[PDB]
Design a protein around this motif. Structure first.
Motif, mmCIF file in Angstrom:
data_model
loop_
_atom_site.group_PDB
_atom_site.id
_atom_site.type_symbol
_atom_site.label_atom_id
_atom_site.label_comp_id
_atom_site.label_asym_id
_atom_site.label_seq_id
_atom_site.Cartn_x
_atom_site.Cartn_y
_atom_site.Cartn_z
ATOM 1 N N UNK A 1 33.560 49.047 33.676
ATOM 2 C CA UNK A 1 32.908 47.715 34.322
ATOM 3 C C UNK A 1 33.614 46.776 34.849
ATOM 4 N N UNK A 2 34.749 46.312 34.269
ATOM 5 C CA UNK A 2 35.692 45.181 34.864
ATOM 6 C C UNK A 2 36.305 45.884 35.981
ATOM 7 N N UNK A 3 36.565 45.119 36.990
ATOM 8 C CA UNK A 3 37.392 45.535 38.038
ATOM 9 C C UNK A 3 38.874 44.951 38.128
ATOM 10 N N UNK A 4 39.080 44.368 37.034
ATOM 11 C CA UNK A 4 40.474 43.688 36.918
ATOM 12 C C UNK A 4 40.605 42.493 37.910
ATOM 13 N N UNK A 5 41.851 42.276 38.164
ATOM 14 C CA UNK A 5 42.474 41.177 38.686
ATOM 15 C C UNK A 5 42.858 41.041 40.096
ATOM 16 N N UNK B 109 42.178 44.380 32.176
ATOM 17 C CA UNK B 109 41.676 43.534 33.243
ATOM 18 C C UNK B 109 40.754 42.572 33.211
ATOM 19 N N UNK B 167 35.225 46.071 44.343
ATOM 20 C CA UNK B 167 35.224 46.632 42.958
ATOM 21 C C UNK B 167 35.254 48.374 43.236
ATOM 22 N N UNK B 195 29.680 39.973 37.294
ATOM 23 C CA UNK B 195 31.082 40.126 36.642
ATOM 24 C C UNK B 195 31.702 38.587 36.754
ATOM 25 N N UNK B 203 40.191 39.941 44.599
ATOM 26 C CA UNK B 203 38.880 40.691 44.886
ATOM 27 C C UNK B 203 37.895 39.794 45.557
#
Lengths: 9, 215
Positions: A1-5, B109, B167, B195, B203
Protein backbone atom coordinates in the motif's frame (compact mmCIF):
# COMPACT_ATOMS: atom_id res chain seq x y z
CA UNK A 1 0.00 0.00 0.00
CA UNK A 2 2.55 2.62 1.09
CA UNK A 3 4.64 4.19 -1.64
CA UNK A 4 7.21 5.43 0.85
CA UNK A 5 8.93 8.79 0.89
CA UNK A 6 10.57 9.00 -2.53
CA UNK A 7 9.77 7.70 -5.97
CA UNK A 8 10.65 4.13 -6.83
CA UNK A 9 14.19 4.06 -8.41
CA UNK B 1 30.01 -15.58 31.53
CA UNK B 2 28.81 -12.09 30.70
CA UNK B 3 25.44 -12.40 32.49
CA UNK B 4 24.06 -9.13 33.94
CA UNK B 5 21.11 -8.24 36.11
CA UNK B 6 21.05 -4.64 34.91
CA UNK B 7 22.47 -2.42 32.18
CA UNK B 8 21.80 1.14 33.34
CA UNK B 9 18.02 1.49 33.51
CA UNK B 10 17.46 -1.89 31.81
CA UNK B 11 16.74 -4.23 34.72
CA UNK B 12 16.01 -7.96 34.50
CA UNK B 13 12.26 -8.47 35.29
CA UNK B 14 11.11 -5.16 33.80
CA UNK B 15 8.26 -4.81 31.37
CA UNK B 16 9.53 -4.29 27.81
CA UNK B 17 8.56 -4.31 24.15
CA UNK B 18 10.47 -6.54 21.75
CA UNK B 19 10.70 -6.79 17.98
CA UNK B 20 9.48 -10.05 16.46
CA UNK B 21 10.61 -11.49 13.11
CA UNK B 22 7.33 -10.20 11.59
CA UNK B 23 8.75 -6.68 12.31
CA UNK B 24 5.84 -6.00 14.68
CA UNK B 25 6.55 -5.32 18.33
CA UNK B 26 5.03 -7.04 21.34
CA UNK B 27 4.95 -6.65 25.09
CA UNK B 28 6.90 -8.94 27.38
CA UNK B 29 9.35 -9.28 30.21
CA UNK B 30 13.12 -8.75 30.13
CA UNK B 31 14.33 -12.09 31.47
CA UNK B 32 18.15 -11.89 30.95
CA UNK B 33 20.97 -9.58 29.87
CA UNK B 34 24.19 -11.03 28.48
CA UNK B 35 27.37 -9.61 27.06
CA UNK B 36 28.03 -11.52 23.84
CA UNK B 37 30.92 -10.44 21.63
CA UNK B 38 30.88 -6.66 21.07
CA UNK B 39 27.73 -5.83 23.01
CA UNK B 40 24.79 -6.88 25.08
CA UNK B 41 21.87 -9.07 24.16
CA UNK B 42 18.49 -8.85 25.86
CA UNK B 43 16.33 -11.89 26.34
CA UNK B 44 12.60 -11.21 26.19
CA UNK B 45 9.74 -13.55 27.12
CA UNK B 46 6.68 -12.25 25.27
CA UNK B 47 3.33 -12.15 27.03
CA UNK B 48 1.44 -13.96 24.29
CA UNK B 49 3.91 -16.44 22.72
CA UNK B 50 7.66 -16.90 22.38
CA UNK B 51 11.11 -15.76 23.52
CA UNK B 52 13.72 -13.78 21.64
CA UNK B 53 17.33 -12.74 22.12
CA UNK B 54 17.50 -9.16 20.92
CA UNK B 55 19.93 -6.29 20.43
CA UNK B 56 19.28 -3.08 22.35
CA UNK B 57 17.84 -1.38 19.27
CA UNK B 58 15.21 -4.09 19.07
CA UNK B 59 13.70 -3.48 22.49
CA UNK B 60 11.62 -0.47 23.60
CA UNK B 61 10.47 0.77 26.95
CA UNK B 62 6.88 0.09 28.05
CA UNK B 63 6.09 3.70 28.67
CA UNK B 64 5.42 6.82 26.69
CA UNK B 65 8.18 9.38 26.74
CA UNK B 66 7.71 12.86 28.18
CA UNK B 67 7.32 14.70 24.80
CA UNK B 68 10.33 16.96 25.66
CA UNK B 69 12.60 13.84 25.66
CA UNK B 70 12.15 13.09 21.94
CA UNK B 71 13.71 14.91 19.05
CA UNK B 72 13.61 14.76 15.24
CA UNK B 73 15.57 11.58 14.46
CA UNK B 74 14.57 9.74 17.58
CA UNK B 75 14.11 6.02 17.19
CA UNK B 76 10.65 4.88 18.35
CA UNK B 77 8.00 2.25 18.22
CA UNK B 78 4.55 3.65 17.37
CA UNK B 79 1.00 2.56 16.80
CA UNK B 80 0.65 1.95 13.07
CA UNK B 81 -2.96 2.33 12.11
CA UNK B 82 -4.08 1.42 8.56
CA UNK B 83 -3.35 -1.55 14.61
CA UNK B 84 0.23 -2.89 15.15
CA UNK B 85 3.31 -1.58 16.89
CA UNK B 86 6.00 -0.80 14.35
CA UNK B 87 9.36 0.97 14.39
CA UNK B 88 10.02 4.38 12.99
CA UNK B 89 11.69 7.73 13.27
CA UNK B 90 10.34 10.96 14.78
CA UNK B 91 10.05 13.41 11.85
CA UNK B 92 8.29 16.27 13.71
CA UNK B 93 7.58 17.00 17.36
CA UNK B 94 4.33 18.34 18.85
CA UNK B 95 3.20 21.83 17.98
CA UNK B 96 -0.17 23.55 17.75
CA UNK B 97 -0.22 23.24 13.94
CA UNK B 98 0.06 19.47 14.11
CA UNK B 99 -2.43 19.27 17.00
CA UNK B 100 0.41 18.38 19.37
CA UNK B 101 1.29 15.11 17.69
CA UNK B 102 4.46 13.39 16.60
CA UNK B 103 5.00 12.76 12.88
CA UNK B 104 6.38 9.24 12.42
CA UNK B 105 8.21 8.01 9.37
CA UNK B 106 7.93 4.23 9.80
CA UNK B 107 10.62 1.77 8.65
CA UNK B 108 8.56 0.60 5.65
CA UNK B 109 7.94 4.12 4.32
CA UNK B 110 4.53 4.77 5.93
CA UNK B 111 3.85 8.10 7.57
CA UNK B 112 1.37 9.16 10.20
CA UNK B 113 0.80 11.53 13.03
CA UNK B 114 0.51 9.84 16.41
CA UNK B 115 -0.30 11.11 19.87
CA UNK B 116 2.06 11.27 22.83
CA UNK B 117 0.46 8.10 24.23
CA UNK B 118 0.99 6.11 21.02
CA UNK B 119 4.78 5.89 20.93
CA UNK B 120 7.52 4.14 22.93
CA UNK B 121 11.25 4.98 22.96
CA UNK B 122 13.64 2.31 21.65
CA UNK B 123 16.02 1.47 24.51
CA UNK B 124 19.45 1.61 22.81
CA UNK B 125 19.20 3.18 19.39
CA UNK B 126 22.15 3.45 17.11
CA UNK B 127 24.06 6.74 17.31
CA UNK B 128 23.03 7.41 13.70
CA UNK B 129 19.49 6.25 14.32
CA UNK B 130 18.68 5.33 10.67
CA UNK B 131 21.50 2.77 10.39
CA UNK B 132 19.26 -0.09 11.45
CA UNK B 133 16.58 0.62 8.82
CA UNK B 134 16.56 -2.47 6.62
CA UNK B 135 15.08 -0.94 3.44
CA UNK B 136 17.97 1.00 1.89
CA UNK B 137 15.60 3.55 0.18
CA UNK B 138 14.01 4.27 3.55
CA UNK B 139 17.39 4.38 5.30
CA UNK B 140 18.81 6.83 2.79
CA UNK B 141 15.74 9.01 2.93
CA UNK B 142 15.79 9.28 6.73
CA UNK B 143 19.50 10.11 6.78
CA UNK B 144 18.88 12.92 4.26
CA UNK B 145 15.82 14.21 6.10
CA UNK B 146 17.34 14.20 9.60
CA UNK B 147 20.59 15.75 8.37
CA UNK B 148 18.78 18.55 6.53
CA UNK B 149 16.32 19.31 9.36
CA UNK B 150 14.98 21.95 9.93
CA UNK B 151 15.29 22.89 6.21
CA UNK B 152 12.11 21.26 4.90
CA UNK B 153 10.92 22.41 1.51
CA UNK B 154 7.23 21.57 1.14
CA UNK B 155 4.49 22.17 -1.44
CA UNK B 156 1.48 24.26 -0.58
CA UNK B 157 -1.54 22.23 -1.65
CA UNK B 158 -5.23 22.98 -1.35
CA UNK B 159 -8.23 20.63 -0.98
CA UNK B 160 -9.58 19.87 -4.49
CA UNK B 161 -6.26 20.52 -6.27
CA UNK B 162 -5.30 18.06 -9.01
CA UNK B 163 -1.74 16.81 -9.24
CA UNK B 164 0.23 13.77 -10.38
CA UNK B 165 1.45 11.57 -7.52
CA UNK B 166 4.00 8.77 -7.94
CA UNK B 167 3.36 5.21 -6.80
CA UNK B 168 5.31 2.03 -7.86
CA UNK B 169 7.12 3.85 -10.69
CA UNK B 170 4.04 5.34 -12.29
CA UNK B 171 2.80 8.92 -12.06
CA UNK B 172 -0.91 8.84 -11.38
CA UNK B 173 -3.68 11.37 -11.75
CA UNK B 174 -4.63 12.34 -8.20
CA UNK B 175 -6.56 14.81 -6.09
CA UNK B 176 -5.78 16.56 -2.81
CA UNK B 177 -8.53 15.56 -0.36
CA UNK B 178 -7.24 17.08 2.88
CA UNK B 179 -4.22 18.80 4.41
CA UNK B 180 -3.13 17.93 7.96
CA UNK B 181 0.07 19.72 9.07
CA UNK B 182 3.00 18.27 7.07
CA UNK B 183 0.78 15.56 5.50
CA UNK B 184 -1.61 15.61 2.57
CA UNK B 185 -4.29 13.00 1.90
CA UNK B 186 -4.01 12.13 -1.78
CA UNK B 187 -6.83 10.36 -3.67
CA UNK B 188 -5.50 8.25 -6.58
CA UNK B 189 -8.20 8.74 -9.17
CA UNK B 190 -7.72 5.55 -11.29
CA UNK B 191 -7.94 3.13 -8.34
CA UNK B 192 -9.86 5.44 -5.74
CA UNK B 193 -7.41 4.73 -2.86
CA UNK B 194 -6.16 7.39 -0.47
CA UNK B 195 -2.63 7.78 0.91
CA UNK B 196 -1.28 10.29 3.44
CA UNK B 197 1.98 11.65 2.00
CA UNK B 198 4.56 14.04 3.40
CA UNK B 199 4.24 17.48 1.77
CA UNK B 200 8.01 17.52 1.25
CA UNK B 201 8.01 14.24 -0.67
CA UNK B 202 9.13 14.23 -4.32
CA UNK B 203 6.35 11.69 -4.92
CA UNK B 204 4.17 14.80 -5.20
CA UNK B 205 4.68 16.25 -8.73
CA UNK B 206 5.14 19.86 -7.62
CA UNK B 207 7.95 18.82 -5.21
CA UNK B 208 9.50 16.55 -7.86
CA UNK B 209 9.44 19.35 -10.39
CA UNK B 210 11.01 21.83 -8.09
CA UNK B 211 13.82 19.42 -7.02
CA UNK B 212 14.53 18.40 -10.61
CA UNK B 213 14.95 22.06 -11.78
CA UNK B 214 16.84 23.02 -8.57
CA UNK B 215 19.38 20.23 -9.23
Amino acid sequence: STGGKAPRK
Amino acid sequence: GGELSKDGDLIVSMRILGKKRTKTWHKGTLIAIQTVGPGKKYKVKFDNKGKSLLSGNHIAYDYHPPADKLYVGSRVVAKYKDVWLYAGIVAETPNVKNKLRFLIFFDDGYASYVTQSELYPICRPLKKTWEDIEDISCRDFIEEYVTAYPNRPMVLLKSGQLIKTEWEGTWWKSRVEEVDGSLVRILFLDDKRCEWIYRGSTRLEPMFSMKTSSA
